Amino acid sequence: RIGKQPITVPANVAIAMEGQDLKVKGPLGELSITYPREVLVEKQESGFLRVRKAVETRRANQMHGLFRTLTDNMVVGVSKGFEKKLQLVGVGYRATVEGKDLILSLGFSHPVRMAIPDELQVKVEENTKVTVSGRDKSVVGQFAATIRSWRPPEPYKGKGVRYVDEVVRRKEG
RNA sequence: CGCUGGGUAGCCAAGUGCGGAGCGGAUAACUGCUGAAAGCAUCUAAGUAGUAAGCCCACCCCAAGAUGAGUGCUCUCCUA
Numbered sequence: 001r002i003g004k005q006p007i008t009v010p011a012n013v014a015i016a017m018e019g020q021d022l023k024v025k026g027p028l029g030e031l032s033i034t035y036p037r038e039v040l041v042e043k044q045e046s047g048f049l050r051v052r053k054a055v056e057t058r059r060a061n062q063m064h065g066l067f068r069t070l071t072d073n074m075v076v077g078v079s080k081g082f083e084k085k086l087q088l089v090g091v092g093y094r095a096t097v098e099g100k101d102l103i104l105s106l107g108f109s110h111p112v113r114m115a116i117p118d119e120l121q122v123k124v125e126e127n128t129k130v131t132v133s134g135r136d137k138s139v140v141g142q143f144a145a146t147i148r149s150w151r152p153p154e155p156y157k158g159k160g161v162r163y164v165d166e167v168v169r170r171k172e173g
Numbered sequence: 174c175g176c177u178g179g180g181u182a183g184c185c186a187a188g189u190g191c192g193g194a195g196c197g198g199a200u201a202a203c204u205g206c207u208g209a210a211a212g213c214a215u216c217u218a219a220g221u222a223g224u225a226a227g228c229c230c231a232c233c234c235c236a237a238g239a240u241g242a243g244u245g246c247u248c249u250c251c252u253a
Binding site: 001002003004005036058059061062063064065066067068069070073136137138139140141142143144145146148149152 | 204205206207208209210211212218219220221222223
């Protein structure tokens with residue numbers, strides 16, 4: 001299952017294990033997550049962490065696999081980083097950068113002046129598609145959903161803000 | 174007011190001014206972000222984001238008999 005899998009820690013990724021807390025030190029940030037009340041972690045003198053249950057119960061079997069893949073997202077998050085590939089479908093849906101902010105002409109009256117945070121490096125390499133880059137997957141997903149929460153792709157319109165190779169329902173009439 | 178014609182100050186509107194503000198807080202329905210119990214998944218079981226004329230606060234007034242009777246400033250207790 002999920003919970004029995006060694007944490008693949010790559011090179012130049014320092015593991016810091018503290019009292020009820022994980023402090024990872026990757027080259028692209030230091031993510032910090034408090035341990036659950038029923039999960040105690042063990043290490044075998046290398047780049048392989050193993051979270052372990054502390055009590056025979058159901059909730060430790062919830063946060064065992066949950067906390068397992070969350071620490072996987074910690075180590076892979078601070079080592080390589082996660083990127084989302086949004087795409088503005090259609091004509092006039094242009095997206096560009098204002099230094100600290102990001103502006104989205106989406107067919108409204110005024111283009112949306114949505115502020116990117118400091119932890120995410122976004123890039124517009126072509127005027128439609130926007131690569132939201134970041135360390136942690138949850139912030140990339142929340143801000144990518146926040147940009148997505150203005151114009152979802154309508155089926156008859158066939159034209160909105162969708163991310164790459166995700167199947168979208170379309171209709172003929 | 175004998176019946177009429179006008180009218181100051183009052184009162185009144187039909188007249189004249191003003192109000193109904195909030196990237197303030199938490200939510201209901203819903204859309205989600207990572208995401209496990211069934212190595213696939215799923216808005217949730219951990220955490221968390223947008224958001225209702227609805228709830229609360231802010232808004233105007235009364236208001237410590239709020240007996241839980243508040244707080245601050247100031248005055249006065251003399252003669253045998």
